[PDB]
Amino acid sequence: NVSLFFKLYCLTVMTLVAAAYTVALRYTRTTAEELYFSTTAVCITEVIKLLISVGLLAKETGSLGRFKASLSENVLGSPKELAKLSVPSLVYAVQNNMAFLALSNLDAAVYQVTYQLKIPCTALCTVLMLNRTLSKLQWISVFMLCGGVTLVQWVVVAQNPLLGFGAIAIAVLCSGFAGVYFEKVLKSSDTSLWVRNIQMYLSGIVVTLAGTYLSDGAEIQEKGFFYGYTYYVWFVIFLASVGGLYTSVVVKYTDNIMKGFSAAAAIVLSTIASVLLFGLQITLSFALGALLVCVSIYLYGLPR
Numbered sequence: 480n481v482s483l484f485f486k487l488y489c490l491t492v493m494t495l496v497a498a499a500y501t502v503a504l505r506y507t508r509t510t511a512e513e514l515y516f517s518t519t520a521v522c523i524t525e526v527i528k529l530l531i532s533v534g535l536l537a538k539e540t541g542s543l544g545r546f547k548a549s550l551s552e553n554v555l556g557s558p559k560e561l562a563k564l565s566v567p568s569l570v571y572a573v574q575n576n577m578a579f580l581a582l583s584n585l586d587a588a589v590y591q592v593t594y595q596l597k598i599p600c601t602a603l604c605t606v607l608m609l610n611r612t613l614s615k616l617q618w619i620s621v622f623m624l625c626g627g628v629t630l631v632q633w634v635v636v637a638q639n640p641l642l643g644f645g646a647i648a649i650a651v652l653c654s655g656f657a658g659v660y661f662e663k664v665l666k667s668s669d670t671s672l673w674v675r676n677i678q679m680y681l682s683g684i685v686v687t688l689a690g691t692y693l694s695d696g697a698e699i700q701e702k703g704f705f706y707g708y709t710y711y712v713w714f715v716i717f718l719a720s721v722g723g724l725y726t727s728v729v730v731k732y733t734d735n736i737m738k739g740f741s742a743a744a745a746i747v748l749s750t751i752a753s754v755l756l757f758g759l760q761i762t763l764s765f766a767l768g769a770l771l772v773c774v775s776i777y778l779y780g781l782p783r
């Protein structure tokens with residue numbers, strides 16, 4: 480019961496943060512005069528995620544000596560684990576940068592609807608890499624989920640919709656791969672979740688900053704690294720840091736496919752709550768989408 484409530488809490492936080500992240504990230508790119516470098520905000524997230532993970536390792540070990548021993552033996556002591564997790568950190572580095580580029584050129588609703596095609600991609604990656612398997616019924620349910628969530632989800636600055644869509648196309652493919660790669664690495668040994676996060680973000684901060692130099696290196700020398708930062712930009716980075724850590728926790732107790740199903744349910748249930756609580760009005764798209772998600776969960780969760 481205590482493990483279940485903690486599991487349901489991490490899901491609701493992950494989804495609520497994911498909802499507030501795309502709206503806030505959209506806002507910061509379409510209102511500012513001095514526009515900030517999206518590559519820097521991505522990199523600062525990896526620093527903040529790394530620091531919170533180190534904090535959470537100290538809590539998990541619960542001792543200054545065994546906190547030292549864990550970082551010595553697992554992080555520094557295993558160079559092969561760092562080289563492994565440098566792959567999905569490089570994939571995520573691209574993903575997170577494509578996320579900023581997409582929302583700079585597209586609406587949050589438009590982005591959210593298009594980005595649900597990660598669900599098929601994530602199912603495809605899990606079947607190939609992870610050594611799991613799906614029946615024809617469960618394959619029908621994954622697309623039925625995808626269709627259901629797309630229905631649930633339905634600027635004075637210059638924009639480029641087709642560049643935005645190209646970014647989502649890249650981001651969809653990174654999400655399925657890096658998540659399933661991370662789930663594979665996480666669930667292949669006894670190593671702690673916060674150690675796997677630290678091993679990844681160490682590569683993450685290097686690769687993101689390398690990308691930050693290559694992308695906007697000349698213009699940062701003129702403008703500044705923290706050029707265009709604000710309460711809302713630091714808020715976006717804050718949500719990006721928290722949202723990433725929660726997804727790692729969700730992928731531990733759930734999997735990358737069930738992450739889609741569960742998050743869909745959390746969006747459906749919390750909206751139905753807010754319809755009753757806050758008198759929130761909803762569309763027929765949502766009403767329809769909600770049922771597809773419910774059926775897809777039922778069809779997916781059935782014994783072969």
Ligand SMILES: CC(=O)N[C@H]1[C@H]([C@H](O)[C@H](O)CO)O[C@](OP(=O)(O)OC[C@H]2O[C@@H](n3ccc(N)nc3=O)[C@H](O)[C@@H]2O)(C(=O)O)C[C@@H]1O
Nearest residue numbers: 493496497500571575578654658718719722723724726727
């Ligand atoms: C910050 C946030 O809310 N991210 C959501 C993202 C979404 O892609 C964002 O637009 C940009 O990442 O989508 C979800 O998740 P998605 O699979 O794309 O996850 C991408 C984000 O999770 C972070 N991550 C992953 C594993 C790990 N061990 N540590 C991490 O920090 C990555 O660094 C990356 O930021 C989804 O499937 O709905 C859910 C995520 O919650």
